[PDB]
Amino acid sequence: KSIRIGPGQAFYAXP
Amino acid sequence: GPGSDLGKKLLEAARAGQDDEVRILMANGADVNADDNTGETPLHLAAYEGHLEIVEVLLKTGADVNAEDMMGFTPLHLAAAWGHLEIVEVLLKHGADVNAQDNQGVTPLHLAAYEGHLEFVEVLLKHGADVNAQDKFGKTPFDLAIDNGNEDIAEVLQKAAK
């Protein structure tokens, strides 16, 4: 994981 | 339908911070609550990009403060996550649901807690944020804060829980 949320980005998104 | 292109121009203008273009497009009847390919409204994109003046204009011309995109985010989710405090406050002042849950059960308090911005946690708590909300993994904002070394927030969240 990592990466802040965004239009096409869930809070929980894989590793 | 008619006006769809104005809505797409408005979405771009809000994302891009084009204050004057937004005003022109609204005066021309653009749909303030049109949404883009992932369900973002102009208010979503303005809050995401930190464009406070445009957030304000969009609210005064009828933006849905609690609109949801395809991930269940509201503008408040995005403004919290990207550290735009004034936008967070303006959104809340205009009826933003402080305890909105996205499609994974994450609330704005979860986000502020994880990111590690104490002032955002305090603001949300002051406006009634739910310290006991659990996301799809049973995690509370406290769990996210403590799992991310944000100890000062974890303690503020604990005292609020009492």
Side-chain angles (χ1 to χ4, degrees):
Chain A
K1 227 185 79 199
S2 170
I3 176 143
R4 264 167 207 173
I5 58 158
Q9 318 290 351
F11 182 76
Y12 289 116
Chain B
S4 58
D5 196 33
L6 281 174
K8 298 162 184 174
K9 286 176 179 298
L10 179 67
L11 289 157
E12 177 55 31
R15 191 157 188 168
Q18 297 281 8
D19 291 23
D20 298 348
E21 187 61 11
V22 170
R23 296 189 186 257
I24 287 164
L25 290 167
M26 294 310 307
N28 282 265
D31 178 8
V32 73
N33 289 321
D35 66 341
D36 76 355
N37 188 51
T38 62
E40 322 309 332
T41 64
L43 185 59
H44 277 104
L45 303 173
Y48 177 56
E49 302 292 350
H51 295 321
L52 171 66
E53 219 284 311
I54 287 168
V55 168
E56 288 169 345
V57 165
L58 290 172
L59 287 164
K60 306 317 283 171
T61 63
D64 171 7
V65 74
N66 287 315
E68 282 181 43
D69 65 20
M70 76 178 304
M71 299 286 90
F73 304 146
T74 60
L76 175 60
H77 281 96
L78 299 167
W82 291 89
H84 301 312
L85 187 59
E86 285 241 307
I87 295 173
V88 166
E89 292 169 349
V90 172
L91 286 172
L92 290 165
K93 173 55 175 149
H94 283 73
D97 173 6
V98 67
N99 287 324
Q101 298 161 283
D102 68 17
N103 296 346
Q104 305 182 320
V106 180
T107 70
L109 188 62
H110 282 98
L111 296 171
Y114 178 76
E115 305 280 339
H117 288 127
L118 177 61
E119 203 180 341
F120 287 68
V121 175
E122 300 173 307
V123 164
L124 294 165
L125 288 183
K126 195 216 284 244
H127 280 79
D130 183 357
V131 123
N132 298 310
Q134 296 189 10
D135 64 21
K136 63 176 296 202
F137 291 119
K139 254 90 179 201
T140 63
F142 175 90
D143 299 332
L144 300 194
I146 200 87
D147 291 340
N148 228 65
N150 302 325
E151 177 61 24
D152 195 340
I153 290 164
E155 294 176 10
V156 170
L157 285 164
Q158 169 70 349
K159 277 209 142 193
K162 310 168 189 157

